[PDB]
Design an enzyme around this catalytic site. Structure first.
Site, PDB file in Angstrom:
ATOM      1  N   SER A 125      73.597  49.230  36.634  1.00  0.00           N
ATOM      2  CA  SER A 125      72.476  47.875  36.352  1.00  0.00           C
ATOM      3  C   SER A 125      72.868  48.589  34.487  1.00  0.00           C
ATOM      4  CB  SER A 125      71.101  47.699  36.454  1.00  0.00           C
ATOM      5  OG  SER A 125      71.433  46.767  37.615  1.00  0.00           O
TER       6      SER A 125
ATOM      7  N   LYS B 262      74.219  47.587  31.160  1.00  0.00           N
ATOM      8  CA  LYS B 262      74.346  46.127  31.011  1.00  0.00           C
ATOM      9  C   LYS B 262      73.594  46.323  29.892  1.00  0.00           C
ATOM     10  CE  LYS B 262      72.839  44.384  35.302  1.00  0.00           C
ATOM     11  NZ  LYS B 262      71.627  43.331  36.339  1.00  0.00           N
TER      12      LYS B 262
ATOM     13  N   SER C 130      67.528  43.222  34.805  1.00  0.00           N
ATOM     14  CA  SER C 130      68.058  43.247  35.586  1.00  0.00           C
ATOM     15  C   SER C 130      68.474  42.523  36.202  1.00  0.00           C
ATOM     16  CB  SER C 130      67.565  44.235  36.860  1.00  0.00           C
ATOM     17  OG  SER C 130      68.849  45.362  36.041  1.00  0.00           O
TER      18      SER C 130
ATOM     19  N   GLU D  27      78.935  41.801  38.921  1.00  0.00           N
ATOM     20  CA  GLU D  27      77.762  42.027  39.796  1.00  0.00           C
ATOM     21  C   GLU D  27      78.017  41.619  41.180  1.00  0.00           C
ATOM     22  OE1 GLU D  27      75.049  43.806  39.639  1.00  0.00           O
ATOM     23  OE2 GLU D  27      75.322  44.848  37.432  1.00  0.00           O
TER      24      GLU D  27
ATOM     25  N   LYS E 119      67.080  51.952  30.212  1.00  0.00           N
ATOM     26  CA  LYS E 119      67.104  50.477  30.675  1.00  0.00           C
ATOM     27  C   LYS E 119      67.200  51.412  32.443  1.00  0.00           C
ATOM     28  CE  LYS E 119      69.147  46.959  32.954  1.00  0.00           C
ATOM     29  NZ  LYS E 119      68.288  47.433  34.258  1.00  0.00           N
ATOM     30  N   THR E 120      67.120  51.212  33.473  1.00  0.00           N
ATOM     31  CA  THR E 120      67.487  51.515  34.823  1.00  0.00           C
ATOM     32  C   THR E 120      68.442  51.052  35.837  1.00  0.00           C
ATOM     33  OG1 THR E 120      65.770  50.722  35.994  1.00  0.00           O
ATOM     34  CG2 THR E 120      65.325  52.687  34.417  1.00  0.00           C
ATOM     35  N   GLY E 121      69.026  52.022  36.935  1.00  0.00           N
ATOM     36  CA  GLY E 121      70.030  51.117  37.556  1.00  0.00           C
ATOM     37  C   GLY E 121      69.808  52.021  38.909  1.00  0.00           C
ATOM     38  N   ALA E 122      70.133  51.048  40.008  1.00  0.00           N
ATOM     39  CA  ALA E 122      70.468  51.907  41.242  1.00  0.00           C
ATOM     40  C   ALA E 122      71.524  51.097  41.838  1.00  0.00           C
ATOM     41  CB  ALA E 122      69.245  51.722  42.121  1.00  0.00           C
TER      42      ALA E 122
END
Ligand SMILES: OC[C@H]1O[C@H](O[C@H]2[C@H](O)[C@@H](O)[C@H](OCCCCCCC3CCCCC3)O[C@@H]2CO)[C@H](O)[C@@H](O)[C@@H]1O
Ligand SMILES: *C(=O)/C(=C/N[C@@H](C(=O)O)C(C)(C)S(=O)O)CO
Length: 265
Positions: free
Chosen positions: A45, A48, A105, A141, A209-212
């Site tokens: 993510s 983005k 997200s 996505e 901004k984080t993502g997994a």
């Protein structure tokens, strides 16, 4: 805490995974810490933020408006759409979609925006236009989070992501108002911003901004600094670790602790 590099190493040994990291001065681009900075990691993510940079570039050129309402349908939605699922009847503006994508997200919001910039190929072309020859988006996505071992699709490197973020936020490629908007969306992250603030010492700025993704993939792109200033870009990615989400979070926080404890470098 160990010195940042020694903490990063410890995090690899504890996670049994690859960590990639850059710490960069936001104003100058000076690289302070680098670890596997030229190795590939899934963006998840975190892409983005770059996505909405491309949107803002279109706004600046007169080819888009943040006000423009996008109408969409239920059949369009993908997994995890907490904001967009609420506006099937009335739609969302381009700017609202960027807020949903970056701050919540929201995956369908991200896909709707990707459609406005020419899809993954169009976003990659935008990256090339701003001089990032490494970062690539290939899928939509949620397939882009698959994080297959060795797969170059949907990856960046810590060095390229940090340089690209700096370009978007500070280089005047984007207009003054657009730079301020991109920054504000990161300041407004609801997923990790408040949690991070709850453990930061008083006086420290955060925007993020984080993502997994699969196979332990985890990441954060952030602005951090003392005296309530966005002093540094910090980019940390993890991949190919079997560790729990909680431990991946804790290891990233540990790297952050080492940076804070050893800030003057
Ligand atoms: O002397 C420096 C500081 O040392 C401690 O602060 C601790 C804090 O109590 C702890 O909660 C945090 O954990 C780390 C939390 C980091 C959160 C994620 C950071 C993100 C930001 C950038 C992208 C990657 C990670 O470490 C710092 C440094 O030891 C003291 O509590 C504080 O009074 C003091 O001002
Ligand atoms: C951003 O990183 C996102 C990650 N989503 C994943 C997650 O672990 O939360 C999935 C479960 C793989 S899925 O994409 O929701 C949101 O795209």
């Amino acid at each position: 805490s160990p010195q940042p590099l020694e903490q990063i190493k410890l995090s690899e040994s504890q996670l049994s995974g690859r960590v990639g990291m850059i710490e960069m001065d936001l104003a100058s681009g000076r690289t302070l810490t680098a670890w596997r900075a030229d190795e590939r990691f899934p963006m998840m993510s975190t892409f983005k933020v770059v996505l909405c940079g491309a949107v803002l570039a279109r706004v600046d050129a007169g080819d888009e408006q943040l006000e423009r309402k996008i109408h969409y349908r239920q059949q369009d939605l993908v997994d995890y759409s907490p904001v967009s699922e609420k506006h099937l009847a009335d739609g969302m503006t381009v700017g609202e979609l960027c807020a949903a994508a970056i701050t919540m997200s929201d995956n369908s919001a991200a896909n709707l925006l990707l459609a406005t910039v020419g899809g993954p190929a169009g976003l990659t072309a935008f990256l090339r236009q701003i001089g990032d020859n490494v970062t690539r988006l290939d899928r939509w996505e949620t397939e882009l989070n698959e994080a297959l071992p060795g797969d170059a699709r949907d990856t960046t490197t810590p060095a390229s992501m940090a340089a690209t973020l700096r370009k978007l936020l500070t280089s005047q490629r984007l207009s003054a108002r657009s730079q301020r908007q991109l920054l504000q969306w990161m300041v407004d992250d609801r997923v990790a911003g408040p949690l991070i603030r709850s453990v930061l010492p008083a006086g420290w700025f955060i925007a993020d901004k984080t993502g997994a993704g699969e196979r332990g993939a985890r990441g954060i792109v952030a602005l951090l600094g003392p005296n309530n200033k966005a002093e540094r870009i910090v980019v940390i990615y993890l991949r190919d670790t079997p560790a729990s989400m909680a431990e991946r979070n804790q290891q990233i926080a540990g790297i952050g602790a080492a940076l804070i404890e050893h800030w003057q470098r």
